Structure 1
Amino acid sequence: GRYIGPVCRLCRREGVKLYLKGERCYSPKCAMERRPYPPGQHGQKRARRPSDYAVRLREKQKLRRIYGISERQFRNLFEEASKKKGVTGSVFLGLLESRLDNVVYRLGFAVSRRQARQLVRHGHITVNGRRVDLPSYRVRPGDEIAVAEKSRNLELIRQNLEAMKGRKVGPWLSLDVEGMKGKFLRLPDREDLALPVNEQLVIEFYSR
């Protein structure tokens, strides 16, 4: 799973600049800047009126690829939210956010979600004391997301927390920047987020 292969190319295609690379898809070159069209022989050609479908499809994939998650798993979360009271949109994102590897990203530790994964699955994160390496782990209210002892001494984590000093975390999230701890504070309300996605079209893609 977890995609692998060409990325700042889905930063493309969707044409709404995904920060998949981390730092590079920030420079003057996610390749999004220098080639602003779809990949392959055509790309730059008379774009044609996309079908309702094409839209709904292209909107869900967008969201899914952000988190980089197998359709299977993505689908699972969707249904979880559907059979649940609350605005299904809101809820869904919460659950998507509440994933460890994404908290790791959204607390800063890691530059990219795909980098944030590798850390997790290498035991470099730890929860409420005890160490964990399961990207799909869903984090709950009041949960210290530290960094394990043998992971505190590493170039990567420093440089990533370096640019985090002083900068702002989600309103539902805290971060002890010194001690590389940090807490999930609540389930993030829809407004807290900023993704380039009309989540309603994703709810509609799955009504088919």
Structure 2
Amino acid sequence: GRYIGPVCRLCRREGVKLYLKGERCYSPKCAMERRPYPPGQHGQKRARRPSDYAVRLREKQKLRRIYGISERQFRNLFEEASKKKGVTGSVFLGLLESRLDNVVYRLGFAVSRRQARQLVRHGHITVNGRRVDLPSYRVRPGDEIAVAEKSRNLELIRQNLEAMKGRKVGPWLSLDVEGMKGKFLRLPDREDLALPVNEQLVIEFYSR
């Protein structure tokens, strides 16, 4: 269970537009702008003071919304991040963002999350000679994100590669659309992924 179905229903849940559902959830509303109130029945019925612990866990939720993952593996990821010596927070953020599918997303081959996964976990992607599926494969500072050879002469392939020619994606990602490659360069950061996330409160829900 990785959720799925009505996704940008959770876009307006927090009211902070979460692209996530492709071109529609990008241009005129992320199932958001139209009715950007937290759904259900109430919504337009006045909320509370979200107890500090609760909304700290809510920026935690928000965090995992920005990925489209289950809380389990994601949890384990947090352990692995907070432990091995580093600046735990930034480490955590960029780390989670080093997940294979999202690489292939922010890179440009995907428009968001579910699609990213679908075609990454498809085996339609190849890294350094070997073609691989698993989205939760967090790559390393020095890899090559290429895409398959029967995945060249194909459709929505040409779509995502169409809209991308003439765009700018992250620095630590090298874009070579003449030869279907993507260099997984330097480690990103908090200022490489500056977005509606406060890693602090997240961490401390996790760091109970």
Range 25-34 or range 43-52, more displaced: 25-34
Deviations 1:58-94 (A, max 9, x none): 1000110111111011111111111122211111122
Range 82-91 or range 124-133, more displaced: 82-91
> Sequence identity, in percent?
100
Gaps in structure 1 of 5+ consecutive residues:
none
Measured in 1, the distance between the counterparts of 2:159 and 2:105 equals: 14
Secondary structure of 2:175's aligned partner: coil
Measured in 2, the distance between the counterparts of 1:27 and 1:185 equals: 30
Deviations 1:108-151 (A, max 9, x none): 00111210101012111110011001111111122111011111
TM-score between both structures, scaled by the size of structure 1 = 0.96
Deviations 1:28-67 (A, max 9, x none): 1222111111111101111211101221111000110111
Superposed displacement of residue 189, structure 1: 2.1
Provide the aligned length of Structure 1 versus Structure 2.
Answer: 208
Q: Kindly indicate which of the two structures has a greater share of residues assigned to helix.
A: 1
Measured in 2, the distance between the counterparts of 1:141 and 1:27 equals: 33
TM-score between both structures, scaled by the size of structure 2 = 0.96
Which runs of 4 or more aligned residues in structure 1 lie more than 3 Å from their structure 2 counterparts after TM superposition?
A: none
Superposed displacement of residue 185, structure 1: 0.4
Tell me, yes or no, if structure 1 residue 70 matches structure 2 residue 70: yes
Correspondence for 1:187: 187
Range 64-73 or range 163-172, more displaced: 163-172
Deviations 1:136-194 (A, max 9, x none): 11111221110111111111111111121121121111111122111100211221112
Gaps in structure 2 of 5+ consecutive residues:
none
Change (3 A) 1:131 1:81: same
Query: Do the aligned partners of 2:94 and 2:193 also contact (CA within 8 Å) in 1?
Result: no
Measured in 2, the distance between the counterparts of 1:154 and 1:7 equals: 27
Measured in 2, the distance between the counterparts of 1:94 and 1:196 equals: 14
RMSD: 1.1
Superposed displacement of residue 101, structure 1: 0.5
